[PDB]
Each structure stands twice: as C-alpha cells, then as structure tokens.
C-alpha cells in the first residue's frame, strides 16, 4: 500500500488552511487519501486516529492542537493510540522552525507507530505544517521501508 | 498576573549563586517574585514546587539537582507535579550550553505546565542558568500568552 | 573500577562489524570488558543487560535493534532496566548521524543508568556506531564521574 489519512485538529475550524497543504504534498509525493477529516479538539482527535488506524493506512498526518494552550491536546491523543513513539522525529520536525519561529519549541507533537501505520503530528501553522513536510520528504520513504521490514 | 516563584534545589547550599541570578533576571524581565527559596535536594524540592503551585504564580524557575549524581531528583520532583512536560524547551535549554559544555546533554532538566503555571528545570551552574535563561528571553512571553489562550 | 560490557543487539548476526569497532574504542579509551555478548532481538537483550548490571560494570553499550522495524526492541529493554533516563545524550547521539544520513532521526535508542551503570543505546551500523561513540569520548569520563559523585 502507499495510503495516507489526514486529520485536522481545530475547533475553530470543525464550525482550514493546512489540509489543502497537506493533501497536495501527498499528492505530490505519491500517497493516495481521503478527505482530511477536520475535528474539535480533544476526543474527536481520538475518535479520528483510532477510525484512520483502522482503515489499516501507511501513515496519518495530524495538524493543529499540538502547543500549550488549553485545548492543545493532540499528542495526548496520540500518545494513547501508538504502540511506540519516535522522538527524534519530532524533535527535527520542532528543529524545522528554528532559529525563524523561536516557539517551535514549544510544539509537544510526537511521532509514532500503530501497528504498520506511522502517525506524525505536524504543528496547526501553514508555515509549521510546511517546516515539518520538508522533514517528512528526507525520511519518510525510508520511514514505511524500515516499518515494513525492507 | 506576572508572578514567579526561584527554587534553588542544593543540599550544599541550603545549609548559592543562581538565586540572585534568576531574581535579577525576573526583575529586568517585568516579574514579581518573592526571595527564592533555598531547599536540599529530593523531597524539599517537591514541598518547594507544591508550594509555588498553590501560590498560583504565572512562572516557576528552578535552579540545581538536574545531572546524573546521586541526589540529583529536581526532575522527577518536577515530573510529579506538572500536567504535561514541554520536551523542546528542555532540549532548546540543553543545546544553549552546547558546544562550550559537553557535559550539557546529561542535564536531565525538565519544563512542564501545572495547571496554568509554567515550570523550568534550569541547571545549577551560574553559566547553565544564563545560558537557560536567555532561551527563555526569546519564547517566555509567548509561552505564558499561550498558555492563557491569548 | 573502569569497566564495560557489549552488547550486540542482532538476530541475523547471532546467528557482528559493530562489536569489534566497540571492543578496539573501549580499549583505546582505557576501559576492560568482556567478549561482546552477541544475542537475538528482543528478551535476549533484557537477559544480557540484566547480566552486564549484576556484573557491577561502570558502562554497558549496546549496538542494533534501535529503528522502527518490527523486531526492533532493545530501547524497550532497556527502558525495562534503567531507573532513569538521560534524554539529551540519546539525542546527541541522533544528531551525529546528521546531515548526512537523514534517517539517524527515526533511532530510538536511550541511554540511562542502572544503580551505578551507565548505559548508552547506539546504532547497529558502523558508521552509526562510530558517530555515537564520539560523541561519547566528549563526555563519558566527566558521566561517570558525576555518576559516582564526583
């Protein structure tokens, strides 16, 4: 398979400007999606990883809800969905921003896996979501190869 | 509010020279804060920051009991009472000292959010905490602000 | 003591490049140790870490089984032994490998210390193993110094 889920976590926008970006670049890159699904912040994140999960996908992009604000709850979400995480990944993606958006750092997204599928949590910013895109295109391929076992 | 609280975590000390750092730091800063308080390594720490919470101040920074010797506990002390950890603030602190102090990367030094209080581990050495703290010149007023949801 | 264990983390080798490079490294830096133990993925690197702690060594390195891949788990057994972790030398370790080889960013490796053992995870290739070990020369002697209290 080379499948791709797209989530968006916005309650603002659930009643979008990154899912454009995000689909076009799995176009791009060669990943066949579905319609980003846009959703409140919190339990609907859940609720949306666990039904990509499900679709048995090569790999979901969340962006948004991944700061320190109050409803930021994103890589909570993600956490309680992944067999493991990938901290180094997150940690470039957050390294992407800099030294031009100092608050990168703030950014509490994670990477991991569920079973076959990697989960990648970009930041809720057109210009974040592209900062951790240009990441995703240095490793990725080789990211679902590894996952695969070659 | 623009309220801080300083806890120095040194057994050594507490029966120092980061406090009047960090105090002189929050003044220049815009903060108010009360005289650190200096307390020994382990359970101190943890009553220190159980106390500073219940203060409700905007901003808790500790100095001290961050590496790898036997009683350095200020992270795990600081793991039990935050909501939620900010890893790249903990990693932008760290690489501030870096490539000057090797040593740098075994500081085990935490930042985290305890309901609407933000809380710094920063290390024990007066060149640690500058370092520490001119990281958080550049995203301290964003942080806060977000943390507050604007 | 100035002691060390190896350990080399590979089904496919159990049945090893990285264990000499580690052996000839160790020797060069002044340490003793033993014949590498060279052991399958997964419980077999909990036994041999288990044995290189009651073993009462000052440093345990262990190369492979650090990516994503299905059988890859020795930063999961190791987790399971330490009592804590040093996050910025696992990533210290991760940024070595970079720019040139994008893909050091989806190691998992920790590093940590068990009573009085430092442990380090490094990567199962011997370039990633070459790269993780100097960033170790840097900093090893001054962590096993502050590890025993000065």
Do not use: M
Not at 21 to 38: C, D, H, K, N, Y
Not at 92 to 110: D, E, F, H, M, N
């Amino acid at each position: 398979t080379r499948s791709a889920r797209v989530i968006i976590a916005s309650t603002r926008a659930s009643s979008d400007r990154c899912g454009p970006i995000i689909t076009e670049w799995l176009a791009q890159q060669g990943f066949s999606s579905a319609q980003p699904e846009v959703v409140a912040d919190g339990s609907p994140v859940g609720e949306a990883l666990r039904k990509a999960i499900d679709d048995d996908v090569d790999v979901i992009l969340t962006s948004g809800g991944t700061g320190i604000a109050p409803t930021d709850s994103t890589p909570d979400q993600t956490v309680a969905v992944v067999d493991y995480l990938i901290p180094g990944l997150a940690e470039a993606i957050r390294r992407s921003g800099l030294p031009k958006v100092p608050t990168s750092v703030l950014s509490r997204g994670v990477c991991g896996v569920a079973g076959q599928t990697l989960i990648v949590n970009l930041p809720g910013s057109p210009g974040g979501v592209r900062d951790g895109l240009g990441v995703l295109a240095g490793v990725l391929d080789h990211a679902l190869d590894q996952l695969a076992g070659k």
